[PDB]
Design a protein around this nucleic acid. Structure first.
Lengths: 165, 38, 196, 138
RNA sequence: AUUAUAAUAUAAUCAGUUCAUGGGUUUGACAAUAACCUAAUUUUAAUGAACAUGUAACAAUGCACUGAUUUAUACUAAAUAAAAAAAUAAAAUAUUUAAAAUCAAAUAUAUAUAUAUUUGUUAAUAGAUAAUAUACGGAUCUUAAUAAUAAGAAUUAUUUA
């Protein structure tokens, strides 16, 4: 299918930081609302993610958005982990990786962590390993900045030039 | 400089250069790896 | 090719023009040739400076988004393709210089190793372990300043010229391995040997 | 500007435990830049029992300061099989898969190896048999 | 051939592992020796349940490539990418340097295309080196729009008049 819905999948793997991604099946509706609230804090909505076209979306990187014409079968397999999810996945329109943003999301996630199924770390801006995700959790990105898009970004104007005489 | 007919790059930090009609092998790490083709 | 294809961003204060030379010169290789006709200029706040360039190259100035592109008449021609990546990079460097300015910090390392502005900026005297006095005149465009005696700064609009000058300055005493000792241009490093 | 930096963790050749200053390991924490005395109060609360000061890999993790999170692991991986038994791997003493699984339960009983599945611990147990003079019976 | 339209750029270099042995010293690299295996969070005890297909364990994606170091640590570190009007063609790792084979072109026979014969597969530099004096026989020869009636090998390879 792909089309616009795979564009929402692209929204999950955009810029900025902090992502969600959890199995749609067995997802507490109260927790789901709280997850939506967590994305609403930065502005956004939960987006359902299904496989078959999700693997196609992951297959093509920085390429023209695929649509119904594009077929999962017509695309080559090779990478066997192309479908990261094992079924229906409900993920808020979150961004990349940020411990500060995920902290609140984790609190909601931890409450019903048994019910939902988290998505394993998938290489995004940097290589992400599901097996080594423990190390990635212990060593995440620097969350010193919280403004992200607003301010900082490119208007941070950091004139480091010479700092040692 | 080791001036010689054979001029192979030893380590990964070695790099081959073509100047003055001569193959030079300079190196960023080990200074012993400097060579010149004749 | 991959470099030359990258489009150059311009801020309204800076203007990248192009026009034919007064007396075009031709570089003659063994088989191939290269006729220098056009003359690109990069005028801006800090200064203005130019690049003499071949005929096959030409700009593509767009009004929208401040982008300009550079292309050659034949990318499959090897020499042209090689030139293309150079010229684009050169004009980017010029843009950077005119808007921001190029910089070259030299830190002196050693007992009594230091620089001094002798002729009111026009001659960088350098004292680096020599009975005879050492130094050289600053070129036109280059402005030198010394925050400390042991830490000199060279500044200019041309990235080529400033960094050449810095290299020349260093050449009086490059860093020794045994003691990290000499003249270090920008982020320069040296693997120190064991004393023994 | 602040980001996950680096500090230190004391263990060198895997150390022991039982809570004490430890010669010159405590001073080695001094080389790291932290003491090792009052930690033994909490460390004793984390180091004792029937085992005679078991050398559970001293996980002496250090924060960017004296304040530090000090821990350990399951009874010395190899020692588990060594204690149970007092070519295939290192042959010698052979540990039945049942006893291997029992040792896996002990390893998984410890919170550190609780995350490690008993099946995966059984595979790790074969590894200790491969290293120390032990054998794992299929 | 294989892997290709998915690399320099990019962090992290980890789960047996600290590989095992010996070993003052050795966790990468001390020499010897060995060389593949687990780990898939959101959550745990000293005298018993393969280990389950969970939509997937598996994945060498490293016996830290390799130094480093007293040995480790530090430390680079196989995992590997961003970036594709797609292949038709501009990736790597090699082997290769061939018309035998295969293929194309052609001859010859029966000839609505049957066999047989023949032809078709690398370049430059370095290596370079003595004694009256440079010595392709000498001059000298590699071409450039603008621009002459007008030059454009005078070298090598295969050929024409």
């Amino acid at each position: 299918r792909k089309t616009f819905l795979i564009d929402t999948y692209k929204h999950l793997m955009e810029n900025s930081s902090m992502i969600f991604f959890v199995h749609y099946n067995n997802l507490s509706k109260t927790e789901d609302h709280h997850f939506r609230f967590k994305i609403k804090q930065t502005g956004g909505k939960l987006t359902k993610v299904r496989n078959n076209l999700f693997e196609v979306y992951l297959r093509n990187s920085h390429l023209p958005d695929p649509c119904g014409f594009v077929k999962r079968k017509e695309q080559n397999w090779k990478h066997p982990l192309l479908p990261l999810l094992k079924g229906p996945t409900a993920t808020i329109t979150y961004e990349d990786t940020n411990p500060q943003q995920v902290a609140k999301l984790l609190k909601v996630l931890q409450s019903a962590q048994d019910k939902l199924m988290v998505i394993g770390a998938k290489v995004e801006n940097e290589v992400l390993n599901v097996e080594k995700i423990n190390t990635f959790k212990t060593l995440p990105t620097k969350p010193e900045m919280q403004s992200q898009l607003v301010s900082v970004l490119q208007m941070l104007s950091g004139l480091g030039l010479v700092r040692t005489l | 400089f080791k001036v010689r007919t054979s001029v192979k790059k030893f380590c990964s930090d070695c790099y081959l250069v073509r100047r003055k009609g001569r193959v030079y092998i300079y190196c960023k790490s080990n200074k012993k790896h400097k060579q010149r083709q004749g | 090719s991959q470099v030359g294809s990258l489009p150059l961003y311009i801020s309204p204060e800076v203007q990248v023009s192009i026009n034919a030379l007064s007396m075009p010169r031709i570089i003659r290789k063994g088989r191939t040739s290269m006729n220098i006709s056009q003359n690109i200029t990069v005028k801006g706040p800090k200064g203005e400076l130019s690049v003499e360039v071949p005929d096959f190259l030409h700009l593509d100035k767009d009004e929208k988004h401040g982008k300009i592109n550079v292309t050659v008449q034949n990318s499959e021609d090897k020499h042209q393709r090689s030139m293309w990546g150079t010229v684009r990079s050169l004009i980017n460097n010029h843009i950077i210089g005119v808007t921001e300015g190029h910089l070259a910090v030299l830190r002196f390392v050693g007992t009594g190793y230091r620089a001094q502005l002798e002729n009111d900026g026009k001659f960088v005297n350098v004292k680096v372990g020599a009975s005879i006095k050492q130094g050289l005149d600053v070129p036109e465009g280059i402005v030198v300043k010394t925050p400390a005696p042991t830490s000199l700064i060279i500044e200019g609009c041309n990235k080529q010229q400033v960094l050449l000058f810095a290299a020349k300055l260093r050449k009086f005493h490059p860093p020794e391995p045994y003691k990290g000792k000499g003249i270090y241009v920008n982020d320069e490093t040296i693997k120190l040997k064991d004393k023994k | 500007m602040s980001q996950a930096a680096k500090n230190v963790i004391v263990k060198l050749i895997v150390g022991a435990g039982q809570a004490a200053p430890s010669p010159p390991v405590g001073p080695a924490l001094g080389s790291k830049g932290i003491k090792a005395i009052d930690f033994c109060k909490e460390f004793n609360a984390r180091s004792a029992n029937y085992q005679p000061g078991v050398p559970v890999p001293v996980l002496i993790t250090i924060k960017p300061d004296r304040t530090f999170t000090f821990e350990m692991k399951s009874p010395p991986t190899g020692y588990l099989l060594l204690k149970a038994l007092k070519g295939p791997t290192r042959a010698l003493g052979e540990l039945s898969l049942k006893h291997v699984y029992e040792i896996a339960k002990i390893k998984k009983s410890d919170e550190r190896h609780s995350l490690l599945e008993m099946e995966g611990i059984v595979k790790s147990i074969v590894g200790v048999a491969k290293s120390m003079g032990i054998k794992v019976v299929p």
